[PDB]
């Protein structure tokens, strides 16, 4: 018990005379998240309403391909970070590519540069009369910008978190946990700022002045990272010998091709440290495999919550003061970020000292399990509200308006969704941060960035699996999602059964993860 009081000194003194570097890292992450969410908030709507009038399916496919590229680029970004380059140099290069890729969109928004670019001058005005039509216009420039921005965001996401984690490595794991808590807090703050301001300006002022802001944000992030590079000296990895470790991994795999790994490696050139690294990698891979369904259910629930909210009563007299012409569809997603922003400081200042006080959770796997339990509870709560609505809709309906689509909603207030998101928020403040901590703690000291990239890649694989599951349940044979051929007509479909299925999947995943976590802790 007294050792907990001893470690409380490190916990309180975690932010020693190095706070400037932590602030710079948090600010860079906040600006990067703001730019990313500004880009991803209204990409489909921007593509549809642009003079290059794409189809809705084409815009959805483009956004999905961009997201998949962002998920896929993380392991390669980590490889580039730890091999042939340093961590800070990789961050700088990725941010430069990020800015270069994102600069394309404001030029496309501006009519003069839009006409100058794409060599096509497509002004068919969508519904305006026209002699037939062509395929996706402005394809080269748009695709180049999308691939550049996706690669940049993937690389920064893979590389920034382990760098900031090792920045405070001098202290104990409690310092790393506090840093990850504030890192997630900064991420949510940036997401809130973006989803509010950038979406408001894009939907209600202009795209030309809307897409210019993310470019300024990424420029500020690059500038602050460059300025803080001089004062960082956060024990830079300076990766030049780490390149050898990756090929020693391939040699260890060839040992399989030519504790078996340890018994062959012993007298073999494979030195003990590389043996421990490969054994750790083999141990940690199943943890990611078990976490895949958690990512699936989390992403699917995040997607379905906005759809559920779209068909509830819009509160607050529909913003009577300064009437919201074409109310943006980003604040519904921002509810979760607001709840996380409220929860995180309270957790960090109260719960962590209380848990660490007597004997409670010293490991992240248990926190992930608790978060998954909260996810299952939130899924059950969401299922119930959906069921009542699908029966309370049988009565008269009220024609509301979000954006420029006349939604049909029941006479049920939106605030009834406060519990679900609340549980979700709790789950996140237990799960995600802990997972990040695990992704930093169990990884070998030479290839943390690669492990982070694999973590994000597996999260993306889970998201893709969730989208595929939604497509599967959309089949007429089941009939749960049959009228969902547009922005949303959930009135004619059963989402409560889908919520219950998500809850059951989350429960099974929780049991499997408990088993796997116990096995990992044993070894």
- Chain residues binding ligand NAG by CB under 6 A are 51, 123, 125
d(CA 53, CA 72): 28
- For residues 347-376, which are near a copy of itself according to CB under 8 A? 358-360
Instruction: Provide, rounded to whole angstroms, the least separation between the CB of residue 514 and a copy of itself.
Output: 9
Angle, CA 285 vertex, CA 290 and CA 303 arms, to 5°:
45
Torsions phi, psi for 493 (to 5 deg): -135, 160
Measured from the Cβ of residue 386, the count of other Cβ atoms closer than 10 Å reads 22
List 313's β-bridge partners, or say none.
413
Choose the contact partner of 169 out of ligand PGT, ligand Y01, ligand NAG, none; CB within 5 to 8 A by kind.
none
Options 384, 412, 465, 516; binder of a copy of itself; rule CB under 8 A: 384
What is the distance between the alpha carbons of residues 433 and 340, in angstroms, rounded to a whole number?
12
| 372 contacts 510 by C-beta, under 8 angstroms | yes
Query: How many angstroms separate the CA atoms of 15 and 179, rounded?
Result: 9
Residue range at the interface with a copy of itself (CB under 8 A); choices 36-44, 257-265, 294-302, 499-507: 499-507
116 binds, among a copy of itself, ligand PGT, ligand Y01, none (CB under 5 to 8 A by kind): none
Q: Which is nearer to ligand Y01, 49 or 468 (CB)?
A: 468
Give the residue from 431, 438, 429, 426 showing the smallest Cα distance to 363.
438
Residue 409 forms beta bridges with which residues? 398
Beta bridge partners of 399: 408
CA nearest neighbour of 179 among 18, 31, 32 = 18
Does residue 391 bind a copy of itself (CB under 8 A)? yes
Asked if 356 and 175 touch (Cβ cutoff 8 Å), the reply is: no
Residue 392 touches ligand PGT, criterion: CB under 6 A: no
Residue 377 interacting entry, from ligand NAG, ligand PGT, a copy of itself, none, C-beta within 5 to 8 Å by type: a copy of itself
Q: How far lies 485's CA from each of 303, 480, 481, 492, 493, in Å? A: 16, 13, 9, 11, 11
Residue 358, contacted partner among a copy of itself, ligand NAG, ligand Y01, none, CB below 5-8 A by kind: a copy of itself
Binding marks (x or -) toward ligand Y01, 401..440, rule CB under 6 A?
Answer: ----------xxx-xx-xx---x--x--x-----------
Interaction of residue 63 with ligand Y01, rule CB under 6 A: no
What are the E-state strand segments in 391-480? 398-399, 408-409
Nearest CA-CA partner of 102 in 191, 195, 212: 212
Q: Which stretch binds ligand PGT (CB under 6 A): 241-249, 267-275, 356-364, 472-480?
A: 472-480
- C-alpha distances in angstroms, 38 versus 31, 196, 207, 217, 455? 10, 9, 11, 10, 24
d(CA 464, CA 80): 25
Closest approach, Cβ 388 to ligand PGT, in A, equals 11
Segment lying near ligand PGT (by CB under 6 A), choices 65-73, 176-184, 364-372, 471-479: 471-479
Output 374 or 498, the one with its CB closest to ligand PGT. 498
Selected binder of a copy of itself within 3, 257, 476, 522 (CB under 8 A)? 522
Residues forming contacts to ligand Y01 in the complex (CB under 6 A) are 57, 60, 286, 289-290, 292-293, 296, 347, 351, 360-361, 366, 370, 377, 381, 384-385, 388, 411-413, 415-416, 418-419, 423, 426, 429, 461, 464-465, 467-468, 471, 497, 500-501, 503-505, 507-508, 511, 514-516, 518
Can you give the binding site for a copy of itself, defined by CB under 8 A? 358-360, 377, 380, 383-384, 387, 391, 500, 503, 507, 515, 518-519, 522
């Amino acid at each position: 018990g007294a050792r907990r009081a001893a470690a409380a000194a490190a916990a309180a003194g975690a932010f020693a005379g190095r706070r400037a570097a932590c602030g710079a890292v948090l600010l860079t992450e906040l600006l990067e998240r703001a730019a990313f969410y500004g880009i991803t908030s209204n990409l489909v709507l921007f593509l549809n309403g642009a003079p290059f009038c794409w189809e809705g399916a084409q815009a959805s496919e483009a956004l999905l391909l961009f997201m998949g590229l962002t998920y896929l680029g993380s392991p390669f970004g980590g490889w580039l970070a730890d091999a042939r380059l340093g961590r800070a140099r990789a961050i700088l290069l990725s941010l430069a590519l990020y800015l270069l890729g994102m600069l394309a969109f404001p030029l496309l928004a501006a009519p003069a540069t839009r006409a100058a670019l794409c060599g096509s001058a497509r002004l068919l005005n969508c519904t305006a009369p026209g002699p037939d039509a062509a395929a996706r216009c402005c394809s080269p420039a748009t695709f180049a910008g999308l691939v550049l921005v996706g690669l940049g965001v993937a690389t920064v996401k893979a590389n920034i978190t382990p760098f900031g984690a090792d920045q405070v490595k001098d202290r104990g794991p409690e310092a790393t946990r506090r840093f990850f808590n504030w890192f997630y807090w900064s991420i949510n703050l940036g997401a809130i700022l973006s989803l509010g301001g950038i979406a408001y300006i894009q939907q209600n002022v202009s795209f030309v002045t809307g897409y210019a802001i993310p470019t300024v944000c990424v420029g500020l992030a690059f500038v602050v990272f460059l300025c803080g590079q001089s004062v960082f000296i956060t024990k830079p990895p300076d990766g030049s010998a780490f390149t050898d470790m990756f090929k020693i991994l391939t040699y260890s795999c060839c040992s399989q091709k030519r504790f078996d790994s340890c018994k062959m490696s012993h007298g073999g050139p494979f030195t003990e440290e590389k043996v421990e690294d490969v054994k750790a990698l083999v141990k940690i891979v199943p943890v990611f495999l078990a976490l895949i369904p958690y990512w699936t259910v989390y992403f699917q629930m995040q997607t379905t919550y906005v759809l559920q909210s779209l068909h509830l009563r819009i509160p607050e007299i529909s913003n009577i003061t300064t009437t919201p012409h074409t109310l943006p569809a980003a604040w519904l997603t921002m509810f979760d970020a607001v709840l996380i922003l409220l929860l995180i400081p309270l957790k960090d200042k109260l719960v962590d000292p209380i848990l660490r006080r007597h004997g409670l959770l010293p490991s992240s796997l248990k926190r992930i399990a608790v978060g998954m339990f909260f996810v299952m509870c939130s899924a059950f709560a969401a299922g119930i509200l959906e069921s009542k609505r699908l029966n309370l809709v049988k009565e008269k309906t009220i024609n509301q308006t979000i954006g420029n689509v006349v939604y049909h909603a029941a006479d049920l207030s939106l605030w009834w969704q406060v519990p679900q998101y609340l549980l979700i928020g709790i789950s996140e403040i237990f799960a995600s941060i802990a997972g990040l901590e695990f992704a930093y703690s169990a990884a070998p000291k030479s290839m943390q960035s690669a492990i982070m990239g694999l973590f994000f890649f597996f999260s993306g694989v889970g998201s893709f699996v969730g989208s595929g599951l939604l497509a599967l349940v959309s089949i007429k044979a089941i009939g749960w999602m049959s009228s969902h051929t547009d922005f949303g007509n959930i009135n004619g479909c059963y989402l409560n059964y889908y919520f219950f299925l998500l809850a059951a999947i989350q429960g099974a995943t929780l049991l499997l993860f408990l088993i796997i976590s116990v096995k990992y802790d044993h070894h």
